[PDB]
Amino acid sequence: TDFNDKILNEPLKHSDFFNVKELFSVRSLFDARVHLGHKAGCRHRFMEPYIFGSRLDHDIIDLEQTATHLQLALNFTAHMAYRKGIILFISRNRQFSYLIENMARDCGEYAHTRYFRGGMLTNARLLFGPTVRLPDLIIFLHTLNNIFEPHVAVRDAAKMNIPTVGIVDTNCNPCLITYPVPGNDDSPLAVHLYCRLFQTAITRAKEKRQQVEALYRLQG
Amino acid sequence: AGSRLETVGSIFSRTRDLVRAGVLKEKPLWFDVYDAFPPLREPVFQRPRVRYGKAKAPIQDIWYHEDRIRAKFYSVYGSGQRAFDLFNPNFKSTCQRFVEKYTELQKLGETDEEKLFVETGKALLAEGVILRRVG
Amino acid sequence: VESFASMLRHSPLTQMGPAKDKLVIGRIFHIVENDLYIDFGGKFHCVCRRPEVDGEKYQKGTRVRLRLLDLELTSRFLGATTDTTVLEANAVLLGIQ
């Protein structure tokens, strides 16, 4: 069916079809403690053009290019869930493992804040069954787990040709991430902001699907 | 799914070359979503290195004159009786009021820093707040 | 017309300056029947045990006073390319409110 594919490629011409500009503000990101970072000794190598400056051995993440890379990441995850996509919150962290799993259940998504075994998304032919639809999008809110080591899900995602939209801070490896964005992910009031912005993206992707279902159903 | 060589480079070019070849007769949807809105940097694989020799980190710091003013204030007096409230974005503590008085007195036109300092001290003492300093 | 430098120039973390002997107020968000995790602000939070006096007074949502030491407090080792992070502040408690 050509009409089924033409209606999906129509919002791709728009630079901002979902209008993801009013979801945040230049002043709201400051009150949520986003520009904060770790010390100067724990700073990773691939983290120099993403830092504005230091404040007594405390790097300050610049919000200029942060908001630029954030809207390009939210728009990428919007078109994925719009075309019947599958997301997965992989963030092994023992502090907010309850809020992440509930936001995916209320919106009908998928989460994974538990221990990662071995042959999950890689060896899916002898574990979950014969043919299993692997998630085409993995959201990494916390890349580093509880051992300070890059997780294996971001390494296996690029193996099976699967993108990954992660939230890199200042001690991660933002190389295999196709849409990185420098931002803090250790503050209590900060992680509640990114978890809510991802929830509002679902309310404008899968809930907005009904606006285009009535256009094709007029013929039959 | 396709090529399992993540150490070569980004996935976009590999998927493009795999589809252009002829073994994978299916256009991925995430590929279309990616080429519809390209980011700013291809996710290439770069092996991290270790700095040696004269190679340093070209990351400048952030300093102002208010830092020196607050340092001198803490060296002369110390901590104030008011507690810092980090929950309020526009919380004016004792140090903020002190540096504001200092800069609004400097905007006039004087060259001696000790005179400005003692004038700001007398002004804040005669205003209302009494900084219980040490002996 | 608001840029980026003016946002953190007047920020409280830049107004306090050094984090050495500073009176800061905090709140309580989680109690493990032994510790009082005080969230004064910033990136990390402070930790402290139950004092012998006013044990039942300190509950979830109690405004207390802290001395405010190092926010992250990290230190490198002998044969370590990087230093570890404890995600703790550890500030000395003063009084109530």
Binding site: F52 | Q60, W63, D67, R68, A71 | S6
Partner: peptide, 25 residues
């Protein structure tokens, strides 16, 4: 506009502790 960070002498530095007999002979 004029709020750019300036790399100066880096304040918040207390005088380093000396020896107990450095000032004497």
């Amino acid at each position: 506009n004029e709020d750019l960070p300036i790399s100066m002498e880096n304040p918040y530095k207390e005088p380093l502790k000396k020896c107990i007999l450095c000032g004497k002979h």
